[PDB]
Design a protein around this nucleic acid. Structure first.
Length: 210
DNA sequence: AAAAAAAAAAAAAAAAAAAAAAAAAAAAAAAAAAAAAAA
């Protein structure tokens, strides 16, 4: 019962990770998005107890459409509580592969010293983290979550020039928001929210990531 | 007839329920530094 449930939750977490990577604009093929449970069992195995697949076997390397040298690692550590040793191992892998972006799918949580390592390591390499329970649901597919589109600096500048706005006068969204963590939004970006309206059909609002 | 002690009148004085945020204390795992055993 452990092997089948573990394979099912690993397949669901991998599907959510690949949908998250496709929503961020990274190069993801259609068969990876439409990968079934039986396809996952054929490709990676179905017995997670005897390392089929291993937790280090499910590492996901993905690249961006516009800039092919901007890539993401997705790590799947097997330890439930993550120390500084595995974080340092992943960081050394990031220097020796020259990649600035990675997401660590932790199981239980992280030590606060490792969180401080993520904080002060941040403006050279971005090292995000995600719980396993948070990645069992694609948040953007919920009926209460409208469409979120990340904007470039040109669209933000055009918005502030058109509406005569300053950046502090806009609405705000926290950096710890599940949608902002899903899209990987850093501080200063502006997210465009397109929602359905019952009086005008649809409505576009703008929020500043703080 | 002048001086002193006790009694009474006049004047100042002090004596209810709910809910959220912040502070605190025991605990508890983690991580860096110091001492000991062995090759």
């Amino acid at each position: 019962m452990d092997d089948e449930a573990e394979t099912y939750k690993l397949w669901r977490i991998r599907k959510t990770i690949m949908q998250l990577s496709h929503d961020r604009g990274y190069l993801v093929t259609q068969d990876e998005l439409d990968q079934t449970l039986e396809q996952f069992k054929e490709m990676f195995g179905d017995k997670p107890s005897e390392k089929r697949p291993a937790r280090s076997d499910l590492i996901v390397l993905v690249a961006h459409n516009d800039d092919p040298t901007d890539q993401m690692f997705v790590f799947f550590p097997e330890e439930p509580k993550i120390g500084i040793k595995t974080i340092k191992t992943y960081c050394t892998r990031m220097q020796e592969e020259n990649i600035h972006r990675a997401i660590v799918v932790v199981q239980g949580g992280m030590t606060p010293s490792a969180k401080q390592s993520l904080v002060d390591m941040a403006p050279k390499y971005i090292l995000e983290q995600f719980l396993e329970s948070e990645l069992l649901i694609n948040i953007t597919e919920h009926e209460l979550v409208p469409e979120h589109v990340v904007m470039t600096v040109e669209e933000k500048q055009e918005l502030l020039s058109r509406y005569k706005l300053k950046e502090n006068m806009l609405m705000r969204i926290q950096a710890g928001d599940p949608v902002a963590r899903y899209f990987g939004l850093k501080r200063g970006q502006v997210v465009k929210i397109i929602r359905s309206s019952e009086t005008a059909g649809r409505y576009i609002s703008y929020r500043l990531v703080c």
